[PDB]
Design an enzyme around this catalytic site. Structure first.
Site, PDB file in Angstrom:
ATOM      1  N   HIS A  74      -7.334   4.223 -11.076  1.00  0.00           N
ATOM      2  CA  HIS A  74      -8.049   2.969 -10.833  1.00  0.00           C
ATOM      3  C   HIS A  74      -9.211   2.949 -11.777  1.00  0.00           C
ATOM      4  O   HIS A  74      -9.811   4.013 -12.045  1.00  0.00           O
ATOM      5  CB  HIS A  74      -8.595   3.006  -9.378  1.00  0.00           C
ATOM      6  CG  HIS A  74      -7.518   3.198  -8.338  1.00  0.00           C
ATOM      7  ND1 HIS A  74      -6.922   2.146  -7.676  1.00  0.00           N
ATOM      8  CD2 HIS A  74      -6.840   4.308  -7.963  1.00  0.00           C
ATOM      9  CE1 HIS A  74      -6.013   2.607  -6.829  1.00  0.00           C
ATOM     10  NE2 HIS A  74      -5.879   3.910  -7.026  1.00  0.00           N
TER      11      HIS A  74
ATOM     12  N   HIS B  62      -1.397   7.819 -10.774  1.00  0.00           N
ATOM     13  CA  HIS B  62      -1.899   6.578 -11.386  1.00  0.00           C
ATOM     14  C   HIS B  62      -3.416   6.619 -11.409  1.00  0.00           C
ATOM     15  O   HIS B  62      -3.988   7.582 -10.906  1.00  0.00           O
ATOM     16  CB  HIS B  62      -1.428   5.398 -10.473  1.00  0.00           C
ATOM     17  CG  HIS B  62      -1.937   5.506  -9.068  1.00  0.00           C
ATOM     18  ND1 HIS B  62      -1.263   6.188  -8.081  1.00  0.00           N
ATOM     19  CD2 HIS B  62      -3.092   5.037  -8.517  1.00  0.00           C
ATOM     20  CE1 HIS B  62      -1.979   6.107  -6.944  1.00  0.00           C
ATOM     21  NE2 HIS B  62      -3.119   5.447  -7.214  1.00  0.00           N
TER      22      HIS B  62
ATOM     23  N   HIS C 212      -0.363  -3.650 -10.395  1.00  0.00           N
ATOM     24  CA  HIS C 212      -1.655  -3.266  -9.780  1.00  0.00           C
ATOM     25  C   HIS C 212      -2.279  -2.102 -10.593  1.00  0.00           C
ATOM     26  O   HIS C 212      -3.506  -1.959 -10.668  1.00  0.00           O
ATOM     27  CB  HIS C 212      -1.464  -2.884  -8.291  1.00  0.00           C
ATOM     28  CG  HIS C 212      -0.756  -3.936  -7.465  1.00  0.00           C
ATOM     29  ND1 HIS C 212      -1.275  -5.191  -7.226  1.00  0.00           N
ATOM     30  CD2 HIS C 212       0.411  -3.884  -6.780  1.00  0.00           C
ATOM     31  CE1 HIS C 212      -0.438  -5.887  -6.475  1.00  0.00           C
ATOM     32  NE2 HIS C 212       0.591  -5.111  -6.179  1.00  0.00           N
TER      33      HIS C 212
ATOM     34  N   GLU D  49     -12.818   4.782  -7.010  1.00  0.00           N
ATOM     35  CA  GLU D  49     -12.707   4.284  -5.663  1.00  0.00           C
ATOM     36  C   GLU D  49     -13.623   5.119  -4.769  1.00  0.00           C
ATOM     37  O   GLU D  49     -14.458   4.529  -4.069  1.00  0.00           O
ATOM     38  CB  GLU D  49     -11.259   4.447  -5.195  1.00  0.00           C
ATOM     39  CG  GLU D  49     -10.313   3.545  -6.022  1.00  0.00           C
ATOM     40  CD  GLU D  49      -9.117   3.106  -5.232  1.00  0.00           C
ATOM     41  OE1 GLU D  49      -8.278   3.988  -4.795  1.00  0.00           O
ATOM     42  OE2 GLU D  49      -9.016   1.865  -5.010  1.00  0.00           O
TER      43      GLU D  49
ATOM     44  N   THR E 200      -5.107   3.517  -0.468  1.00  0.00           N
ATOM     45  CA  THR E 200      -6.155   2.548  -0.791  1.00  0.00           C
ATOM     46  C   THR E 200      -5.652   1.215  -1.249  1.00  0.00           C
ATOM     47  O   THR E 200      -6.451   0.319  -1.593  1.00  0.00           O
ATOM     48  CB  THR E 200      -7.125   3.067  -1.870  1.00  0.00           C
ATOM     49  OG1 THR E 200      -6.420   3.135  -3.123  1.00  0.00           O
ATOM     50  CG2 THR E 200      -7.689   4.486  -1.478  1.00  0.00           C
TER      51      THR E 200
ATOM     52  N   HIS F  88      -5.301   9.565  -9.236  1.00  0.00           N
ATOM     53  CA  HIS F  88      -4.745   9.938  -7.948  1.00  0.00           C
ATOM     54  C   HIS F  88      -3.378  10.534  -8.211  1.00  0.00           C
ATOM     55  O   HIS F  88      -2.479   9.872  -8.783  1.00  0.00           O
ATOM     56  CB  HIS F  88      -4.589   8.676  -7.078  1.00  0.00           C
ATOM     57  CG  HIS F  88      -5.906   8.115  -6.520  1.00  0.00           C
ATOM     58  ND1 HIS F  88      -5.991   6.808  -6.007  1.00  0.00           N
ATOM     59  CD2 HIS F  88      -7.160   8.651  -6.422  1.00  0.00           C
ATOM     60  CE1 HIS F  88      -7.269   6.579  -5.644  1.00  0.00           C
ATOM     61  NE2 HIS F  88      -7.998   7.657  -5.925  1.00  0.00           N
TER      62      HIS F  88
HETATM   63  N1  LIG Z   1      -4.221   4.659  -4.205  1.00  0.00           N
HETATM   64  S1  LIG Z   1      -3.452   5.623  -3.283  1.00  0.00           S
HETATM   65  O1  LIG Z   1      -4.187   5.699  -1.997  1.00  0.00           O
HETATM   66  O2  LIG Z   1      -3.167   6.922  -3.987  1.00  0.00           O
HETATM   67  C1  LIG Z   1      -1.915   5.022  -3.020  1.00  0.00           C
HETATM   68  N2  LIG Z   1      -1.679   3.842  -2.404  1.00  0.00           N
HETATM   69  C2  LIG Z   1      -0.370   3.526  -2.250  1.00  0.00           C
HETATM   70  C3  LIG Z   1       0.203   2.352  -1.615  1.00  0.00           C
HETATM   71  C4  LIG Z   1       1.592   2.259  -1.625  1.00  0.00           C
HETATM   72  C5  LIG Z   1       2.446   3.247  -2.174  1.00  0.00           C
HETATM   73  C6  LIG Z   1       1.841   4.355  -2.827  1.00  0.00           C
HETATM   74  C7  LIG Z   1       0.459   4.475  -2.824  1.00  0.00           C
HETATM   75  S2  LIG Z   1      -0.432   5.779  -3.461  1.00  0.00           S
HETATM   76 ZN   LIG Z   2      -4.756   5.252  -6.057  1.00  0.00          ZN
END
Ligand SMILES: NS(=O)(=O)c1nc2ccccc2s1
Ligand SMILES: [Zn+2]
Ligand SMILES: NS(=O)(=O)c1nc2ccccc2s1
Length: 257
Positions: free
Chosen positions: A93, A91, A61, A103, A195, A116
């Site tokens: 997006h 990571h 992802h 996002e 998210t 993030h």
């Molecule tokens: N994109 S985030 O909201 O930072 C994020 N989503 C997820 C979902 C599963 C495990 C870790 C994360 S960290």
């Molecule tokens: Zn994220």
């Protein structure tokens, strides 16, 4: 099972993760006319001096840079937060073209990508218990605009060929996440969610007002990654962003006037 493609993309997630239609989903648009200065907020305290990076992983992802979170080594405190949140991973997006990828949006403006930095509340003992709590995570969101290259980012962009496909990982030690931070730590904050699935409503979002800059060559390298595993049909990892969800009954606060 879930993804960003047209048949398994964010508009489908609710059939397996009904919380997708919950009342504190992320991301959101940040309406800076409506956001409210709150000079009772504290200054954020980002302590990454002792951060210990371990590894970088393509997870199908996005790619995560993971940290040793077994002690209070790199923690985020202060701001809207009570107690100490340990960095576990970061990571990004990003989009297929420069005018999309973030996002969060700021007055409906989209950035080319968003970083993030994910942290968990040490009162819950581990990350998997923390995600089950409304105050379990704190995610620092940092916008990327296309401009002059970020030296602190080049080290991430140079290892991407080694994790090109889903499930590949590479040792990634001695990486200093401080080099991804802008000069100012002014921010907006609101209560929200992960998210991506499981979309749990466990996040205090701290979104920095100042973007960082990345070059066009740098964001190109993100877009060369693959969603698929080795052997499989090639699907470029791009547009791995969820669109803005309804604010519903929520207030965005600003650390600055
Ligand atoms: N994109 S985030 O909201 O930072 C994020 N989503 C997820 C979902 C599963 C495990 C870790 C994360 S960290
Ligand atoms: Zn994220
Ligand atoms: N609801 S979902 O996890 O996004 C999901 N969408 C699809 C579409 C086709 C096959 C399986 C799933 S699982």
């Amino acid at each position: 099972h879930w993804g960003y493609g047209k048949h398994n993309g964010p508009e489908h997630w609710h059939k397996d993760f009904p919380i997708a239609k919950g009342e504190r989903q992320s991301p959101v648009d940040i309406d800076t006319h409506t956001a409210k200065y709150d000079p009772s907020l504290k200054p954020l305290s980002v302590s990454y001096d002792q951060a210990t990076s371990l590894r970088i992983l393509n997870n199908g992802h996005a790619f995560n840079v993971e940290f040793d979170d077994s002690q209070d080594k790199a923690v985020l405190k202060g701001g809207p937060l009570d107690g100490t949140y340990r960095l576990i991973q970061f990571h990004f997006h990003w989009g297929s073209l420069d005018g999309q990828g973030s996002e969060h949006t700021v007055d409906k403006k989209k950035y080319a990508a968003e970083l993030h930095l994910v942290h968990w509340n040490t009162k819950y003992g581990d990350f998997g218990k923390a995600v089950q709590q409304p105050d379990g995570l704190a995610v620092l969101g940092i916008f990327l605009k296309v401009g002059s290259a970020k030296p602190g980012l080049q080290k991430v962009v140079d290892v991407l060929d080694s994790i090109k496909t889903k499930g590949k990982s590479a040792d990634f030690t001695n990486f200093d996440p401080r080099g991804l931070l802008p000069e100012s730590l002014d921010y907006w904050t609101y209560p929200g969610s992960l998210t991506t699935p499981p979309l749990l409503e466990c996040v205090t979002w701290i979104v920095l007002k100042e973007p960082i800059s990345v070059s066009s060559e740098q964001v190109l390298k993100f877009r060369k990654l693959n969603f698929n595993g080795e052997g499989e049909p090639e699907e470029l990892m791009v547009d791995n962003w969820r669109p803005a969800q309804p604010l519903k009954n929520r207030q965005i606060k600003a650390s600055f006037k």
